[PDB]
Amino acid sequence: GKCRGLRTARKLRSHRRDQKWHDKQYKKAHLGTALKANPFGGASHAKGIVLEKVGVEAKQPNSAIRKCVRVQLIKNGKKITAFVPNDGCLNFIEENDEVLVAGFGRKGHAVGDIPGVRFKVVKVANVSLLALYKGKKER
Amino acid sequence: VTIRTRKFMTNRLLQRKQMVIDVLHPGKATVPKTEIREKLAKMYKTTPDVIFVFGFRTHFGGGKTTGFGMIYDSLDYAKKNEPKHRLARHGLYEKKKTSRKQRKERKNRMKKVRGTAKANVG
Amino acid sequence: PVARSWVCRKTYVTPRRPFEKSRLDQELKLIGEYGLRNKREVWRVKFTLAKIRKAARELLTLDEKDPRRLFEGNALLRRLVRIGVLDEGKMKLDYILGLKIEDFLERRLQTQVFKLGLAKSIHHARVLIRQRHIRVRKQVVNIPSFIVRLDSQKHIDFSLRSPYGGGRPGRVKRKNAKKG
Amino acid sequence: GIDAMNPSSRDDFTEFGKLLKDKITQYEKSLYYASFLEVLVRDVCISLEIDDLKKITNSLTVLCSEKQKQ
Amino acid sequence: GIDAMNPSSRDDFTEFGKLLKDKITQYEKSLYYASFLEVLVRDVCISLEIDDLKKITNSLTVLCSEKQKQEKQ
RNA sequence: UGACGGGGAAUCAGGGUUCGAUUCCGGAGAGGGAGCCUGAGAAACGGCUACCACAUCCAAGGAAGGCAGCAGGCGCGCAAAUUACCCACUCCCGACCCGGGGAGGUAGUGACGAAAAAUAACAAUACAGGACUCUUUCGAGGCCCUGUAAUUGGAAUGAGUCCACUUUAAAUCCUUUAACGAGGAUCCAUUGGAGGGCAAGUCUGGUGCCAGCAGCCGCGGUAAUUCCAGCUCCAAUAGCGUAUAU
């Protein structure tokens, strides 16, 4: 049963102000701790420097070795793991290159079949991987 | 080819007549303003270089052209009241070209000196 | 601080469910009948009928002698009888809601050049308008979406500078009429 | 100096390749230059590897787009 | 006489191309031959037309396609 | 507090929710802080006096500083334009019709976005359909219509080159108009897709849990409806795909 009288607007609004914090998107986007632990800091992309190239195996029902890169970001110095998307697009990358790294499409959660990886690479050295991949530009 | 004159105001303060020109020229390009001045001066019993026209916009489709024109009493009232770009379209006037940036540099350099030296610092 | 106006609006609303086969079927039928070019030309007519019906759907919840109803209903029905999609006898506000979307597509200049016999098909009517052939009472119209209200529906002619009008035939025939 | 050269080093092959480039590009405005260079490219790339050939073919491919870009 | 050749005819250009082919193919076993030939092909095709460069690229890629055919089976 | 406030903005059935640095008003500040001169009006910074901080020239005795004005470069960045033209306009200042104004107007870069809208049309012939007054069936008619075929055909026109006008301080762009300008009209429209969600392959070749696609479910271990290619098609269309706030 709710508090439904006529002079009770303060009880209703100071209830719904406090039970909004149990909603997860309101708490995750309005408390402020998510923006300090996120490696981007609220950006759409981030430029960074490839440290080392990795391969990570897929989760249990798939069997593959997904080709990814470890990037160190210029902007705040944190180190991320990003996935270089298309077929044969690992080979276009030298180490110690500027790559422009975007999120994976699920806004902070890291899934696909690849564990603990939520970043993907769009550019390498100001040429994009679609233009490198189709044969429209060169290195 | 055909001049029609829309709304007419004879203006005793600036000594002119004020009207809006309609020009029908259905097989031709936009007619020159000299031919409009000759046709309207043949219409209003006056000489063709006391009358000044401007702002002719040809309508879409090849049709009429519509702009402004004003007919002065004499050339001396024209040399008092008309704008200097519109007299300079007639060869009655010409401006001295520096025009704006060399004047500004000469203005900020004539502040550095004092006395009679402002004339002999250019 | 500039002497400008930035006032603009969008004039179509993209549909919510993008791949429903019944919606694709009916709007492609309207494209193929009325000689439109793409689906945005259908959605724009859906937006203007939706704005008309939103105005009538707002006015119809009032007491019938409130003067906003008695002024703006008369103005809105007068504009719909003026463009011709609501006929002269049935000027009541309940007959706005019985407008189908094919009323405003019949009053375009492309469909009124095809229905007035000035073209051999409707696609010939749009390519005749776009090549500066059709004029409406001495104004040469290059717009295929010109909605002809019925004091201009009477005067639809060929141009005075067109080969199917007065004369001066085009560059194809006059290059062709030089044989030697 | 083109016939007398026998390059084994990297910089020697670069100088040999630059001398061959300067000799070939003098006749670039000939009408028969396109057929002659295509025959020469086909002969010299027959001993090349599949990875080198597909790299060389891609080198022509995006540059043809660069002709459309420029 | 590669440096002394000045071919203007089609047959003279074919003999010049044959002399150039015999000189280049002697260093085919060098490890720097692939980089040198790619640099030479890039320099010589920079002046070529859009139709001409496409025919040169198609001839090498079909040879590349034929090389994948013979090596696999 | 990634908080200037408001008029307002995007969504929206009614309710809400979120955004508002931003062209109008009101406040605040000209690197950080102070303290003042003149003046009707200032705690002025295109005024002065110091301190802090950073910097330029020096004859090392001294001198001068402030782009959060318009342009511009450094730097930080995912992320933002030309060291252009002029007072014609709209107004302001001045002792003033007369001088001044990077206030403003005008051009340039500009797919942030918004409105209009090209990329062919028609007539033949041949083939196939349709309904047929005739026709139990073979078979009809331009005694009637619908589609296709890089199979023909002469009619229309702008993209574009470009005399002029016209616009305008002076040019430009738009509009008007004279001459050129279309066969495959090579004057060649793209971006994502074809298992379900979700409109569209139960096709041909390669790889054989490898490479990879996959927002989710999942496909891949030698008839892959999903990868890599070709053909066909199917949405949207001068645009569409992806990433984050919402």
UniProtKB/Swiss-Prot annotation, chain A:
PTM annotation: Hydroxylation at Pro-61 affects translation termination efficiency.
Q: Which Pfam families match?
A: Ribosom_S12_S23
Ranges of Basic residues composition bias in the record? 1-19
Q: Where in the cell is it found?
A: Cytoplasm, Cytosol; Cytoplasm; Rough endoplasmic reticulum; Nucleus, Nucleolus
Entry's Gene Ontology molecular function annotations: RNA binding; structural constituent of ribosome
Q: Which domain of life is it from?
A: Eukaryota
Sorted keywords for this record are: Acetylation, Cytoplasm, Deafness, Disease variant, Dwarfism, Endoplasmic reticulum, Hydroxylation, Isopeptide bond, Nucleus, Ribonucleoprotein, Ribosomal protein, Ubl conjugation
Residues with the N6-succinyllysine modification: K53
Show the stretches that span the lipid bilayer.
none
Q: Its GO CC terms?
A: cytoplasm; cytosol; cytosolic ribosome; cytosolic small ribosomal subunit; endoplasmic reticulum; membrane; nucleolus; nucleoplasm
Keyword Cytoplasm carried by entry: yes
Task: From the UniProt entry, list the residue stretches annotated as the region Disordered.
Answer: 1-25
Q: Main localization of the protein? A: cytoplasm
* Heme among keywords: no
Q: Where is this cross-link: Glycyl lysine isopeptide (Lys-Gly) (interchain with G-Cter in SUMO2)?
A: K36
For the modification N6-acetyllysine, the affected residues are K134
A GO biological process held by the record: ribosomal small subunit biogenesis
As stated in the Swiss-Prot or TrEMBL entry, residues carrying the post-translational modification 3-hydroxyproline are P61
Q: Known Gene3D superfamilies for this protein?
A: Nucleic acid-binding proteins
Q: What is the similarity comment for this entry?
A: Belongs to the universal ribosomal protein uS12 family.
Subunit structure as annotated in this protein's UniProt entry:
Component of the 40S small ribosomal subunit. Part of the small subunit (SSU) processome, composed of more than 70 proteins and the RNA chaperone small nucleolar RNA (snoRNA) U3.
Cited function: Component of the ribosome, a large ribonucleoprotein complex responsible for the synthesis of proteins in the cell. The small ribosomal subunit (SSU) binds messenger RNAs (mRNAs) and translates the encoded message by selecting cognate aminoacyl-transfer RNA (tRNA) molecules. The large subunit (LSU) contains the ribosomal catalytic site termed the peptidyl transferase center (PTC), which catalyzes the formation of peptide bonds, thereby polymerizing the amino acids delivered by tRNAs into a polypeptide chain.
Report the protein name in the record: Small ribosomal subunit protein uS12
Species in which this protein is naturally found: Homo sapiens (Human)
Write the gene name. RPS23
UniProtKB/Swiss-Prot annotation, chain C:
Where in or outside the cell it occurs: the entry states:
Cytoplasm; Nucleus, Nucleolus
Q: Which domain of life is it from?
A: Eukaryota
Q: What is this protein called?
A: Small ribosomal subunit protein uS4
Spell out the NCBIfam families in the cross-references: PRK04051.1, uS4_arch
Segment Disordered: which positions? 161-180
Q: Which CDD domains match?
A: S4 (cd00165)
Q: Which PROSITE patterns match?
A: RIBOSOMAL_S4, S4
Tell me where the transmembrane regions lie.
none
GO cellular component assignments? cytoplasm; cytosol; cytosolic ribosome; cytosolic small ribosomal subunit; extracellular exosome; focal adhesion; membrane; nucleolus
A molecular function (GO) held by this record is: structural constituent of ribosome
PTM Phosphoserine: list the residues.
S152, S162
Q: Does the keyword ATP-binding apply?
A: no
Where does the record place the modification N6-acetyllysine?
K65, K115, K154
Kindly state a single biological-process term from the GO annotations of this entry.
ribosomal small subunit biogenesis
- Among the Pfam families in the record, one is S4
Q: Summarize subunit and interaction data from the UniProt record for this chain.
A: Component of the small ribosomal subunit. Identified in a IGF2BP1-dependent mRNP granule complex containing untranslated mRNAs. Part of the small subunit (SSU) processome, composed of more than 70 proteins and the RNA chaperone small nucleolar RNA (snoRNA) U3.
The location annotated for the cross-link Glycyl lysine isopeptide (Lys-Gly) (interchain with G-Cter in SUMO2) is K92, K138
Instruction: Identify the coding gene.
Output: RPS9
Identify its protein family. Answer: Belongs to the universal ribosomal protein uS4 family.
InterPro entries associated with the record: Ribosomal_uS4, Ribosomal_uS4_CS, Ribosomal_uS4_euk/arc, Ribosomal_uS4_N, S4_RNA-bd, S4_RNA-bd_sf
Any idea what job this protein has?
Component of the small ribosomal subunit. The ribosome is a large ribonucleoprotein complex responsible for the synthesis of proteins in the cell. Part of the small subunit (SSU) processome, first precursor of the small eukaryotic ribosomal subunit. During the assembly of the SSU processome in the nucleolus, many ribosome biogenesis factors, an RNA chaperone and ribosomal proteins associate with the nascent pre-rRNA and work in concert to generate RNA folding, modifications, rearrangements and cleavage as well as targeted degradation of pre-ribosomal RNA by the RNA exosome.
Q: Which segments constitute the S4 RNA-binding domain?
A: 107-180
Keywords assigned by UniProt, alphabetized: Acetylation, Cytoplasm, Isopeptide bond, Nucleus, Phosphoprotein, Ribonucleoprotein, Ribosomal protein, RNA-binding, rRNA-binding, Ubl conjugation
UniProtKB/Swiss-Prot annotation, chain E:
Q: How is it modified after translation?
A: Phosphorylated. Phosphorylation is enhanced upon serum stimulation.
Q: Which family is this protein grouped under?
A: Belongs to the eIF-3 subunit J family.
Quote one Gene Ontology molecular function term. translation initiation factor activity
The organism is: Homo sapiens
Does the record bear Ubl conjugation in its keywords? yes
Q: Gene for this protein?
A: EIF3J
Keywords, A to Z, come to:
Acetylation, Coiled coil, Cytoplasm, Initiation factor, Isopeptide bond, Phosphoprotein, Protein biosynthesis, Ubl conjugation
| Keyword Cytoplasm listed | yes
Q: Give the record's subunit note.
A: Component of the eukaryotic translation initiation factor 3 (eIF-3) complex, which is composed of 13 subunits: EIF3A, EIF3B, EIF3C, EIF3D, EIF3E, EIF3F, EIF3G, EIF3H, EIF3I, EIF3J, EIF3K, EIF3L and EIF3M. The eIF-3 complex appears to include 3 stable modules: module A is composed of EIF3A, EIF3B, EIF3G and EIF3I; module B is composed of EIF3F, EIF3H, and EIF3M; and module C is composed of EIF3C, EIF3D, EIF3E, EIF3K and EIF3L. EIF3C of module C binds EIF3B of module A and EIF3H of module B, thereby linking the three modules. EIF3J is a labile subunit that binds to the eIF-3 complex via EIF3B.
GO terms under cellular component: cytosol; eukaryotic 43S preinitiation complex; eukaryotic 48S preinitiation complex; eukaryotic translation initiation factor 3 complex
Q: What is its subcellular localisation? A: Cytoplasm
Free-text function comment from the UniProt entry? Component of the eukaryotic translation initiation factor 3 (eIF-3) complex, which is required for several steps in the initiation of protein synthesis. The eIF-3 complex associates with the 40S ribosome and facilitates the recruitment of eIF-1, eIF-1A, eIF-2:GTP:methionyl-tRNAi and eIF-5 to form the 43S pre-initiation complex (43S PIC). The eIF-3 complex stimulates mRNA recruitment to the 43S PIC and scanning of the mRNA for AUG recognition.
The biological process GO terms on file are: formation of cytoplasmic translation initiation complex; translational initiation
Instruction: Return the protein name.
Output: Eukaryotic translation initiation factor 3 subunit J
